[PDB]
Amino acid sequence: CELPSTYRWTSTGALAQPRSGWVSLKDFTVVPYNGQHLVYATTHDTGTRWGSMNFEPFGDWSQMATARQNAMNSPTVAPTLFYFAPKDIWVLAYQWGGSAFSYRTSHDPTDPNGWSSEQVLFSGSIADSATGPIDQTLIGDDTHMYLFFAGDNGKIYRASMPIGDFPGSFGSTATVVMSDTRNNLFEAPQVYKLQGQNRYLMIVEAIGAQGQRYFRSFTATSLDGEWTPQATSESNPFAGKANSGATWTDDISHGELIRTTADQTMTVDPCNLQLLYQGRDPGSGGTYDLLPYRPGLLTLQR
Numbered sequence: 001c002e003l004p005s006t007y008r009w010t011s012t013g014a015l016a017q018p019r020s021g022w023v024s025l026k027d028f029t030v031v032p033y034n035g036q037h038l039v040y041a042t043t044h045d046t047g048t049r050w051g052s053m054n055f056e057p058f059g060d061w062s063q064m065a066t067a068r069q070n071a072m073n074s075p076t077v078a079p080t081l082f083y084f085a086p087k088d089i090w091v092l093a094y095q096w097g098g099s100a101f102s103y104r105t106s107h108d109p110t111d112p113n114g115w116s117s118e119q120v121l122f123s124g125s126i127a128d129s130a131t132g133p134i135d136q137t138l139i140g141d142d143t144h145m146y147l148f149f150a151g152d153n154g155k156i157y158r159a160s161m162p163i164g165d166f167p168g169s170f171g172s173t174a175t176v177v178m179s180d181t182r183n184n185l186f187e188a189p190q191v192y193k194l195q196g197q198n199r200y201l202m203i204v205e206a207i208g209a210q211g212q213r214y215f216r217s218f219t220a221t222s223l224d225g226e227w228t229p230q231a232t233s234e235s236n237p238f239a240g241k242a243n244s245g246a247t248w249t250d251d252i253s254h255g256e257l258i259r260t261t262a263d264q265t266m267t268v269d270p271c272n273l274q275l276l277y278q279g280r281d282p283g284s285g286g287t288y289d290l291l292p293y294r295p296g297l298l299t300l301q302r
């Protein structure tokens, strides 16, 4: 199932409303867990407070709306969840901790409050960014773990370490692997191994001509290699208003692909791509932090 040069999706509407007290659910990370979906997300309340949560595991996507929403007592904004197989330990990576990126570990990722004390994941800084490093994602191959991240500044960054040294810090240095205008490579990168192909997929969130969010895609044949544009304009995006099949939202924004595995290989099935994204009613206005983001799911047409 080669990636299409022109993507066509169908979509759900919003799959859950935020639990009373939160105005939004955002930045989804999602793994398979004992035949169910296990999702973590960023929260925002009705004032000025960012936080995080998970849902109870749920079997089918109709069950997301009724799955109990569990606030985390330790905020892990824009989280990445995965199982790190070589040490039989679950990892939750995030930002806005004591350094640029942080992680915690657990033996039960369903427990929102069962994560370890905060560990340093990345301690670097980047030039020409108001946010600093944001929206990490991690992926490993046979020999190395990789960290990719953005800076709301048109650049995508990469760090690596031998897989035997993980979990641990990637250090303080990173390599720019792509650069473009701020709007073209904005944030929310996600990197995956394509099942059955010697190819990796990166999707990156962009800001379109009239402010609408959408995803641009790139591929590589090795995680330390160069990235090649795969679907990189608003009119021919990886996923956006042009091809989502969604009218409940114009935005197709910070989310994650459904994976074939929970572990660090971050594998996805190109025969059945599905994107769990955040979207919002186009009639929604007000400040960015209060925007009523909700989860939705795209399914690739083939």
Ligand SMILES: [Ca+2]
Pocket: 027, 028, 029, 078, 079, 080, 135, 136, 137, 188, 189, 190, 255
């Ligand atoms: Ca993310």
